[PDB]
Scaffold this active site. Structure first.
Site, PDB file in Angstrom:
ATOM      1  N   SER A  48      34.215  38.366  27.261  1.00  0.00           N
ATOM      2  CA  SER A  48      34.196  37.199  28.137  1.00  0.00           C
ATOM      3  C   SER A  48      35.073  36.102  27.552  1.00  0.00           C
ATOM      4  O   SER A  48      35.094  35.903  26.338  1.00  0.00           O
ATOM      5  CB  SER A  48      32.770  36.675  28.285  1.00  0.00           C
ATOM      6  OG  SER A  48      31.929  37.652  28.868  1.00  0.00           O
TER       7      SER A  48
ATOM      8  N   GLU B 186      30.414  40.996  34.804  1.00  0.00           N
ATOM      9  CA  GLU B 186      30.532  40.289  36.078  1.00  0.00           C
ATOM     10  C   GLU B 186      32.010  40.073  36.408  1.00  0.00           C
ATOM     11  O   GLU B 186      32.728  39.417  35.648  1.00  0.00           O
ATOM     12  CB  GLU B 186      29.811  38.935  35.985  1.00  0.00           C
ATOM     13  CG  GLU B 186      29.971  38.017  37.192  1.00  0.00           C
ATOM     14  CD  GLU B 186      29.323  36.655  36.991  1.00  0.00           C
ATOM     15  OE1 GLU B 186      28.815  36.090  37.980  1.00  0.00           O
ATOM     16  OE2 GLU B 186      29.322  36.140  35.852  1.00  0.00           O
TER      17      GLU B 186
ATOM     18  N   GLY C 217      33.993  31.583  30.600  1.00  0.00           N
ATOM     19  CA  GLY C 217      34.278  32.894  31.190  1.00  0.00           C
ATOM     20  C   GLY C 217      33.096  33.534  31.896  1.00  0.00           C
ATOM     21  O   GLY C 217      31.979  33.017  31.848  1.00  0.00           O
ATOM     22  N   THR C 218      33.346  34.672  32.547  1.00  0.00           N
ATOM     23  CA  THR C 218      32.308  35.385  33.305  1.00  0.00           C
ATOM     24  C   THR C 218      31.306  36.054  32.367  1.00  0.00           C
ATOM     25  O   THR C 218      31.578  36.238  31.182  1.00  0.00           O
ATOM     26  CB  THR C 218      32.896  36.465  34.246  1.00  0.00           C
ATOM     27  OG1 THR C 218      33.536  37.492  33.479  1.00  0.00           O
ATOM     28  CG2 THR C 218      33.900  35.858  35.226  1.00  0.00           C
ATOM     29  N   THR C 219      30.148  36.421  32.912  1.00  0.00           N
ATOM     30  CA  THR C 219      29.076  37.018  32.117  1.00  0.00           C
ATOM     31  C   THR C 219      29.358  38.490  31.818  1.00  0.00           C
ATOM     32  O   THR C 219      29.754  39.246  32.704  1.00  0.00           O
ATOM     33  CB  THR C 219      27.711  36.905  32.830  1.00  0.00           C
ATOM     34  OG1 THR C 219      27.513  35.562  33.293  1.00  0.00           O
ATOM     35  CG2 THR C 219      26.574  37.287  31.883  1.00  0.00           C
TER      36      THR C 219
END
Ligand SMILES: [Cl-]
Ligand SMILES: [Cl-]
Ligand SMILES: [Mg+2]
Ligand SMILES: [Mg+2]
Ligand SMILES: [Mg+2]
Lengths: 243, 241, 191, 244, 111, 250, 235, 231, 240
Positions: free
Chosen positions: A74, A46, A29-31
């Site tokens: 995330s 993010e 997943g995204t930060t």
């Protein structure tokens, strides 16, 4: 073998492979990050701009629990929403019975117990999210991070997602350079920078920044989103640091 | 081989899931120790905070179950907290129903029976934790009772738990052979904590700072944990002798 | 109130003052015109420094107080020492949701270190009211003045009400700790 | 989920057989032999105890023969623990009938209901069947003396003489050879013991390895008596027939 | 004891012509001897050229009208936007009313 | 969520074996030796206290348990399974008997109720059998003294004397030679200690041996006086000192 | 084994796809819709000559204005018909009117996917639902166990469906009369049936606005079969 | 492979294969396009038929006077989700006298789909939805996927060969967004967008399906001769 | 509750559990149904490997559902009792609400519906039983004979057989039974039923059961001697 095929099964090591497999989804997943400050906390995330067709500012990932707690996560986004929905029910029943808004450590355990419950049976799947959350209560500011296993700890700074190692390294530097403490308005600016630095590990698609914060002085102890001039001020600060 | 996935008997009469839950106990790589004084019961545990970003005040494997009962856990923190919350609920319910504070050994038995159910019932997995309950019981005096994933429990003169448990156990065994008694013959709890720490240093062969340890103390009518400064004060006394 | 059941009267009070809060009450308990207990203790502990004054049905108020004590013991195990406001909320939650089957009038009084002395009253309906005192008072009285205020007030209630009588019990809640006081008829009657 | 560990106890084989019922019958075939023989003036129940130990308390023991009511008894072959569950249910059913109609339950009705319970475990519930075969010996005013058997399938049939458990093939041949319709109880008693004596896996048949019972109209005038034989009474009847 | 019913007064009138129909009603709402409102409508356009009024106890009248309006909405969803005939609406309202046969809506309904 | 294991975990194999019961019996075989001997005026039950650690207090762990004032129990196999069975056995003695008939159940019926509980674990959904064999000694007015064994299958057998667990084969042979129908209680206790010494390897004393009796009534252990019909419990657990006295004259 | 409500890698429900194979084994059923009515015809397919063919009920009435033909595991259709009839009558009770053919079909198809681990498996039967209402007129629907229904001008289901559907493709036009449709069903049934078509092993039915749903007698169908053979030999 | 037997199982790399197989059912489904301006929102859907004798599968469903969606994949699943939306829209009206926000509509769908991916026995929904609506904050377009992920967009497309229409809208973004107060021109842009996903077949009168909602326009669907204008 | 879907579809479109239930029927003893002009006759095989049986008390193969309807079967005996009980209850329930006994078709349709329900209910297996249901509708003299099977399909038959070696006896009935002219009398119908069983049975001693049903609740079971007379008559005519 076949120990990894079912949830809640101990391997010969003593491990629950299904929970470790859920962590892989979190790493994918995204930060997202969390920064504890003098009199509050700051959350940032993010948001990958997959396309031009995405409406800016209108796919909000950070969620509020009650009026004083902020949650970001995330991994599998729907799993995070499910967890927050539970958190809101937990916080509601606490305030219903005990009048006072739920303390952050109390709230942290409510989520922790719920996530841990999803590692006890084979009829459920573990949560595919690491959740960074916190806020301000009677005892001051608190930041937490909760993992698929149900494990959580209090943090000075927290990070999870694809650019977690980059973010962690940058968080560790803040803790060293600011032992006496970091201010709320500073933490917002630092949060922006760290997301931008952590975006180097996800640099194919360009991204959108989203920040929120709780602060006893700045937000009066309530959770609010960072918008407008304050948001653009933080973006400009981050843009200047990468170059 | 599905007899190794759920809690049913293997051909040789074993429950592999219970055995693997025991191996999860040492996953934290923390050693704990418990000893009894005259008026008190002291429990100590290693405190390892590897990440610099962690808030060390929130990193704890010692729990205050009731006013009188304390519990230290060897195992992963999610299962630890699961056990802690249940024990707290059981201790509170007991008091309400029966009109007096739940004894340490009765709570231990209750939690051990719950653990036993997980070894027999298939849908529930065992918790990968060893629960060490301590108190100063109003009838039995200083008490140490320990529970494991098998649903086994027993009282102890003293005890140790963790990866290097055997080295600590024999260290304590050799002391009670010498002293010829069932407890630490000491008036104040402060010196019983100093004993506990000293013998952990000798067994493990490591030195400890104030942040490397975590201490719980049970006295009559209250159990409490020590702060970093309370431990530091305690470490100074050991060094000056 | 169920017929023939034990009534707790209604002569109870709690007064906040400089150093904390004081609870006060009589000791009479009736079944009609018969005094079932003349040395009753209507001042009950739900937590170290949170106490209550019970009125109405003795059975109902005891059952509630017992449940509240359970909730605050469990609260303390998980979330640390509760507030006096939290204690009053649990009382209310019980008295309000079961208002059809209960006859309980409760005064909750407690001592925090931040909030100091607080007093909450919970009448029959199940409503909550935070007050400086409950049953010519001045804010920030001394311990000795507040004792005399409760003593003189309950003394008169006993004088004119037959549902009230016996001794005057009082509990003092301060940062120092908890102090129990008692005053016998020969003292308060001739005030 | 849990689907992985399900044995699926209530399903058909490709050949149209119920796996668990067939395997339960295999289990029962290793159990001690039990014989029921119906005569014109009574019924005999004989059963062989499973490899007896010398220190086993024989007189205060009950493994094979159980009483359901004053007019009906059963001989067990299979898991004793399973049988007792079913027996208590049967005892209760008989009393429910007596309470409802003020009349002792007809033998077949009791047998059918008990057999219907077994059937249920083969068709639904996902549980293993009862590893038990019964021989029902009883009397009622409609059909008189009756012998039935039920097995884990829940199928029951009526008999003049029947065996269950081990060596039923050999036992049924011997019964078919020497049985006749105008037989008396005392003759049936002798046939039962002789049959066990030849089909037994033991070296020699003795009193301590047996359970025995009769249902006669030997009581005073138009009433049925159940006689569960004592150890000494089995010892005497074994000598009287010339086996020991 | 708690009386769940009340009388909000008012009166309504429905007349049918050859190619038209009227449903009239006063706009006064009352309790006992007091006036609550001088203009509180109780004749409603429910869609599909159906007008409706439920006069008597206003709380029950408002709930019934609200349910019928919602019944019209779901009739369209389930039956390809078919128009609800007046006779079909009448039969539907019978089922709404009789569904509370043992705790009735205290209203006289006209459509 | 919810218990989805509503199906049997114990089932018949092609050979007719009930695997889980057989494997439970295997676990009992691995268990520590316990035994029971029936005398004319009493019953004795005994077992070795296998200490997990020398730091552990073996007094706190009781292998021999009182079920009713006149009934006692011991086991071989898995201790935790035994502990919960004792809890259920004590409760069922009240709910299904004492609260109905105003008196404690006779040995055979309490045994029957325990056997029922163990049979259910063999057939009910989502459970394994109990990994223990019980020896239940008791007395009641109409049946007198009795001794029963109860297996994981739920099968129970009455015994004059028997042993279960580690060295049961040799122990049963030993008891066959020594047992007769004229044994007094003290003689049975003596034989019990002899039989148990064979299976015990390490220390053999009152602190490592647990032993109880079902014998005469004990008015001193009743806790009150005034009711003539209430004469006290027949179950009595022998003390560490009482055992050592009999080990001298061994 | 594997879950009942599982998706294949291609993105289809295994059990639904397997139930479609069962329907292919079923006897042929053909429906044709016209402006004068809708015709439903079926292959009876008696497994033995001793079986009384008149007892084979593969065409069924749902309401006066709606009919139904089936193909596949025909025992599974009984509860579907029961539901349809209740839905039709219930709607009349609530709304004092006939129920739309599409709404009725939609109600039946809601049952279809109500299976899993509700019933244990999908239905193993396809339905041709034919009817008339005031809004959309004469209609023919094909209700599958997938929960999907298509409206058709003409439709064949069963063993000879792909062959019969190709034939219906060429033969159907918008100006077909009722009599022409009747003969067309009989023609196509005779082509795809194993045994020789007659009044005993094949059945006809129709639904018209005026007379409602009617299953034809064996005497009436026999004359239409005789009329069909003569017309084919005539050129 | 071994980790696709049910939705409750994670793969070693952290994937949910049953959810991905449900996503695959959408790719097989017929193309549908969504796009909006500031005043209006438009759904354009290519309907699919079994054969020439069959009707064309209806893709668009109305949820309220101000909201509705188009479907791609399992149609019965769309009926279940659309029915749930209808109730939630209706609950908001009856209880709060309030038109349900299109954003909340998406949140509710997300949470309903999610519960089906974490529990044993059930299965993920096998359909993708494009929700359009006009509420108190103007026009909206949402893309629902049965993984649970809901995304607010200016324009999008889902189904077979949807990449062609999605590329077109990405190019045309600046043009069609400013088509304010002009329904027919916004539709034209949507019809030209869906045309980029066509192969061999073209848009006919009973093939094309269009829906629209806006400022002074209730959610209304156009089929048959009503869409002949846009061919 | 136990929920498992036991009866499910396979790749080739078969429900194996229903088909394996038919194999159980094929293993069961043979049962035959033949209907005449004014009667129906139900013949049943009884395997002769079981001697020392008590025929008084042993469950009879043919069961009365009501005074005018009978049910025979082939397959699992224990399963049949559940269907028979349900049918008998429904027969009384019908009389209670409709004030008229069930028709043979209705009773068949009910039983068949029960069988079908077990082919798509969770936690249950299909009935390993096929039935032959026969009788006469109230105030009616037309003979009725129906067959059901595990899948849940049912149908009417002029004559039919089920069970082991049923394909042999069906072959016999297919050439010997005339639709245009069925057995005119009771004797003719019974004889044809016995003849058809003699193609399969072995010996005509205590192996064949015959039950005759006639209009207006007139049902009677034949004894050994009565049946043996038919066996003796057929064998003498055979030797030619
Ligand atoms: Cl317990
Ligand atoms: Cl009181
Ligand atoms: Mg704690
Ligand atoms: Mg388990
Ligand atoms: Mg007075």
């Amino acid at each position: 073998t076949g120990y990894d095929l079912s949830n809640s099964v101990f391997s010969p090591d003593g491990r629950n492979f299904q929970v470790e497999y859920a962590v892989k989804a979190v790493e994918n997943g995204t930060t997202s990050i969390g920064i504890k400050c003098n009199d509050g906390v700051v959350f940032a995330v993010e948001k990958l701009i997959t396309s031009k067709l995405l409406v800016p500012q209108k796919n909000v990932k950070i969620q509020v629990v009650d009026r004083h707690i902020g949650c970001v996560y995330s991994g599998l986004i729907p799993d995070g929403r499910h967890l927050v929905n539970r958190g809101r029910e937990e916080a509601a029943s606490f305030k219903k019975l005990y009048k006072t808004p739920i303390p952050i450590p109390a709230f942290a355990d409510r989520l922790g117990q719920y996530v841990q419950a999803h590692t006890l049976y084979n009829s459920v799947r573990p949560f595919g999210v690491s959740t960074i959350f916190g806020g301000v209560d009677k005892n001051g500011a608190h930041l937490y991070m909760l993992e698929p296993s149900g494990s959580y700890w209090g943090y000075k700074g927290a990070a999870t997602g694809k650019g977690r190692q980059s973010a962690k390294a940058e968080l560790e530097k803040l803790v060293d350079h600011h032992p006496e403490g970091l201010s709320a308005r500073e933490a917002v600016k630092q949060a922006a920078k760290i997301i931008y630095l952590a975006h180097e590990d996800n640099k194919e698609k360009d991204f959108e920044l989203e920040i929120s914060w709780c602060s006893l002085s700045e937000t009066n102890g309530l959770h609010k989103f960072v918008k407008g001039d304050l948001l653009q001020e933080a973006i400009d600060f981050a843009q200047k640091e990468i170059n | 081989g599905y007899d190794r996935h759920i809690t049913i008997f293997s051909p040789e009469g074993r429950l592999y899931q219970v055995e693997y839950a025991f191996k999860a106990t040492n996953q934290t790589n923390i050693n704990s120790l418990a000893v009894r004084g005259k008026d008190c019961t002291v429990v100590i545990s290693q405190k390892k905070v590897p990440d610099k970003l962690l808030d060390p005040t929130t990193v704890s494997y010692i729990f205050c179950i009731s006013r009188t009962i304390g519990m230290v856990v060897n195992g992963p923190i999610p299962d630890a907290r699961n056990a802690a919350l249940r024990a707290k609920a059981e201790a509170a319910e007991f008091r309400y129903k029966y009109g007096y504070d739940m004894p340490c050994d009765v709570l231990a038995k209750r939690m051990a029976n719950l653990s036993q159910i997980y070894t027999q019932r298939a849908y529930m997995r065992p918790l990968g934790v060893i629960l060490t309950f301590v108190s100063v019981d109003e009838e039995l005096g200083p008490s140490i009772y320990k529970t494991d994933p098998a649903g086994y429990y027993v009282g102890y003169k003293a005890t140790a738990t963790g990866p290097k448990q055997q080295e600590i156990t024999t260290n304590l065994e050799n002391h009670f052979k010498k002293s010829k008694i069932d407890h630490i013959n000491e008036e104040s709890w402060e010196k019983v904590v100093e004993f506990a720490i000293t013998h952990m240093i000798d067994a493990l062969g490591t030195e400890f700072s104030k942040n490397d340890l975590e201490v719980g103390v049970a006295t009559k009518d209250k159990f409490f944990t020590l702060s970093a400064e309370n431990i530091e004060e305690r470490l100074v006394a050991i060094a000056e002798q | 109130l169920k017929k023939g059941e034990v009534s707790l009267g209604t002569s109870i009070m709690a007064v906040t003052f400089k150093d904390g809060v004081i609870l006060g009450a009589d000791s009479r308990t009736t079944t009609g015109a018969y005094i079932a207990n003349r040395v009753t203790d209507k001042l009950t502990r739900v937590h170290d420094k949170i106490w209550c004054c019970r009125s109405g049905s003795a059975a109902d108020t005891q059952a509630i107080a017992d449940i509240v004590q359970y909730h605050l013991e469990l609260y303390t195990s998980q979330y640390g020492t509760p507030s006096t406001e939290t204690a009053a909320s649990v009382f209310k939650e019980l008295c309000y949701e079961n208002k059809d089957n209960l006859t309980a009038g409760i005064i909750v009084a407690g001592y925090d270190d931040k909030n100091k002395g607080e007093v909450y009253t919970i009448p029959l309906g199940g409503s909550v009211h935070k007050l400086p005192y409950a049953i010519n008072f001045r804010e920030n009285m001394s311990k000795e003045e507040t004792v005399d205020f409760i003593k003189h007030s309950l003394s008169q209630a006993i004088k004119w009400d037959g549902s009230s009588g016996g001794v005057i019990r009082m509990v003092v809640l301060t940062a120092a700790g908890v102090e129990r006081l008692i005053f016998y008829p020969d003292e308060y009657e001739q005030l | 989920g849990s689907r992985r560990y399900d044995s699926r106890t209530t399903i058909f084989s490709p050949e149209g057989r119920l796996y668990q019922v067939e395997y339960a019958l295999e289990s029962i075939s290793h159990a001690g032999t039990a014989i029921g023989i119906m005569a014109s003036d009574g019924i005999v129940l004989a059963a062989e105890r499973k490899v007896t130990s010398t220190l086993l308390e024989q007189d205060t023991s009950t493994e094979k023969l159980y009483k359901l009511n004053d007019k009906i008894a059963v001989a067990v072959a299979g898991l004793t623990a399973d049988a007792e569950i079913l027996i208590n249910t049967a005892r209760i059913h008989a009393q429910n009938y007596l309470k409802t109609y003020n009349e002792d339950i007809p033998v077949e009705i009791l047998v059918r209901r008990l057999s219907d319970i077994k059937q249920g475990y083969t068709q639904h519930g996902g549980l293993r069947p009862f590893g038990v075969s019964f021989i029902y010996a009883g009397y009622d005013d409609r059909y008189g003396y009756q012998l039935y058997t039920s097995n884990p399938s829940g199928n029951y049939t009526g008999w003049k003489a029947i065996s269950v458990g081990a060596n039923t093939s050999a036992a049924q041949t011997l019964l078919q050879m020497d049985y006749k319709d105008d037989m008396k109880v005392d003759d049936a008693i002798e046939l039962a013991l002789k049959t066990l004596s030849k089909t037994t896996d033991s070296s020699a048949l003795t009193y301590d390895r047996l359970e025995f019972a009769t249902i006669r109209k030997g009581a005073n005038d138009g009433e049925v008596y159940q006689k569960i034989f004592k150890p000494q009474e089995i010892k005497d009847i074994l000598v009287k027939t010339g086996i020991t | 004891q708690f009386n769940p019913y009340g009388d909000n007064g008012g009166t309504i009138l429905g007349i049918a012509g050859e190619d038209f129909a009227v449903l009239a009603g006063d706009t006064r709402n009352i309790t006992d001897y007091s006036i609550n409102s001088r203009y509180e409508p109780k004749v409603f356009d429910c869609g599909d050229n159906i007008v409706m009024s439920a006069n008597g106890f206003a709380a029950d009248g408002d709930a019934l009208v609200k349910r019928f309006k919602n019944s019209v909405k779901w009739y369209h969803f389930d039956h390809n936007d078919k128009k609800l005939s007046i006779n079909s609406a009448a039969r539907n309202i019978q089922h709404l009313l009789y569904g509370k046969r043992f705790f009735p809506y205290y209203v006289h309904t006209i459509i | 969520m919810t218990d989805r294991y509503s199906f049997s975990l114990t089932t018949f194999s092609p050979s007719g074996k009930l695997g889980q019961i057989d494997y439970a019996l295997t676990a009992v075989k691995q268990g520590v030796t316990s035994l029971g001997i029936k005398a004319t005026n009493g019953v004795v039950i005994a077992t070795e206290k296998k200490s997990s650690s020398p730091l552990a207090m073996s007094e706190t762990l009781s292998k021999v348990s009182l079920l009713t004032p006149d009934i006692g129990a011991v086991y071989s196999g898995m201790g935790p399974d035994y502990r919960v069975l004792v809890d259920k056995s004590r409760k069922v003695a009240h709910t299904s008997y004492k609260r109905i008939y105003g008196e404690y159940p006779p040995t055979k019926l309490l045994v029957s109720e325990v056997a029922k509980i163990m049979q259910e674990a063999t057939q009910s959904g989502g459970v394994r059998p109990f990994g223990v064999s019980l020896l239940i000694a008791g007395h009641d007015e109409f049946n007198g003294f009795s001794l029963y064994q109860v297996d994981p299958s739920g099968s129970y057998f009455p015994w004059k004397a028997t042993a279960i667990g580690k060295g049961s084969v040799a122990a049963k042979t030993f008891l066959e030679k020594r047992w007769n129908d004229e044994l007094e209680l003290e003689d049975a206790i003596h034989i019990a200690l002899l039989t148990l010494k064979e299976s015990v390897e390490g220390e053999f004393n009152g602190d490592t041996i647990e032993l109880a009796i079902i014998g005469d009534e004990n008015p001193d252990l009743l806790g009150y006086t005034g009711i003539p019909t209430d004469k006290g419990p027949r179950f009595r657990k022998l003390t560490s000192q009482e055992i050592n006295d009999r080990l001298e004259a061994l | 084994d594997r879950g009942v409500s599982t998706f294949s890698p291609e993105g289809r429900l295994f059990q639904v796809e397997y139930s479609l194979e069962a329907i292919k084994l079923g006897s042929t059923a053909i429906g044709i819709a016209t402006k004068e009515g809708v015709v439903l015809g079926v292959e009876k397919r008696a497994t033995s000559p001793l079986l009384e063919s008149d007892s084979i009920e593969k065409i069924v009435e749902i309401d006066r204005h709606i009919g139904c033909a089936m193909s596949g595991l025909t025992a599974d259709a009984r509860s579907m018909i029961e539901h349809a009839r209740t839905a039709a009558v219930t709607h009349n009770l609530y709304y004092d009117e006939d129920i739309n053919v599409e709404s009725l079909t939609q109600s039946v198809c809601d049952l279809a996917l109500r299976f899993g681990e509700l019933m244990s498996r999908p239905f193993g039967v396809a339905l041709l639902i034919a009817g008339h209402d005031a809004d959309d007129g004469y209609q023919l629907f094909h209700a599958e166990p997938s929960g999907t229904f298509y409206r058709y001008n003409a439709k064949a289901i069963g063993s000879g469906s792909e062959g019969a559907q190709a034939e219906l493709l060429n033969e159907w036009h918008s100006s077909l009369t009722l009599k022409e449709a009747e003969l067309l069903v009989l023609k196509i049934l005779k082509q795809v049936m194993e045994e020789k078509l007659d009044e005993n092993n094949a059945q006809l039915s129709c639904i018209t606005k005026q007379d409602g749903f009617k299953i034809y007698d064996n005497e009436k169908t026999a004359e239409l079969i005789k009329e069909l053979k003569e017309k084919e030999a005539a050129e | 492979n071994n980790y696709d037997g049910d939705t409750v199982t994670f793969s070693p790399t952290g994937r949910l294969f049953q959810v991905e197989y449900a996503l695959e059912a959408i790719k097989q489904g017929s193309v549908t396009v969504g796009l909006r301006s500031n005043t209006h929102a438009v759904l354009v859907a290519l309907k699919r038929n079994a054969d020439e004798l069959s009707s064309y599968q209806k893709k668009i469903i109305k949820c309220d006077e101000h909201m509705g969606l188009s479907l791609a994949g399992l149609a019965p699943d769309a009926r279940v989700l659309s029915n749930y939306l209808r109730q939630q829209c209706n609950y908001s009206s009856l209880v709060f006298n309030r038109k349900l926000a299109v954003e909340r509509a998406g949140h509710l769908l997300c949470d309903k789909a999610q519960k089906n991916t974490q529990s044993y026995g059930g299965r993920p929904y096998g359909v993708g939805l494009l929700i359009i609506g006009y509420d108190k904050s103007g026009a909206h377009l949402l893309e629902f996927q049965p993984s649970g992920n809901v995304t607010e967009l200016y324009g999008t497309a889902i189904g077979a060969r949807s990449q062609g229409a999605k590329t077109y809208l990405e190019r045309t973004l600046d043009t069609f967004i400013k088509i304010d107060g002009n329904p027919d021109e916004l539709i034209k842009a949507g019809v030209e967008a869906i045309s980029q996903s066509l192969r061999d077949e073209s848009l006919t009168v009973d093939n094309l399906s269009i829906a629209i909602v806006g400022k002074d326009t209730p959610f209304t669907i156009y089929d048959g001769e009503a869409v002949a204008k846009y061919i | 509750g136990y929920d498992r879907a036991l009866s499910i579809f396979s790749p080739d479109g078969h429900i194996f559990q229903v088909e394996y239930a038919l194999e159980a029927v094929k293993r069961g003893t043979c049962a035959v149904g033949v209907k005449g002009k004014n009667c129906v006759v139900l013949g049943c095989e009884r395997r002769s490997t079981l001697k020392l049986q008590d025929t008084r008390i042993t469950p009879s193969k043919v069961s009365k559902i009501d005074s005018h309807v009978v049910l025979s079967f082939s397959g699992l005996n224990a399963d049949s009792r559940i269907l028979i009980e349900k049918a008998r209850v429904e027969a009384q329930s019908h009389r209670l609400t409709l004030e008229d006994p069930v028709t043979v078709e209705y009773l068949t349709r009910y039983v068949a519906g029960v069988q079908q329900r077990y082919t798509q209910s969770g936690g249950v297996r299909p009935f390993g039983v096929s039935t032959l249901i026969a009788g006469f509708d109230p105030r009616d003299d037309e003979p009725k004979l129906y067959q059901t099977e595990p899948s849940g399909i049912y149908s009417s038959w002029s004559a039919q057989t089920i069970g082991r070696n049923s394909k042999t006896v069906r072959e016999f009935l297919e050439k010997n039974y005339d639709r245009k002219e069925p057995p005119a009398t009771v004797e003719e119908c019974v004889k044809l039923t016995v003849r058809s069983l003699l193609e399969v049975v072995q010996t005509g001693a205590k192996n064949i059961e015959i039950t005759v049903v006639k209009p207006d609740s007139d049902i009677v079971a034949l004894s050994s001697e009565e049946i043996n007379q038919y066996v003796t008559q057929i064998e003498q005519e055979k030797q030619e």
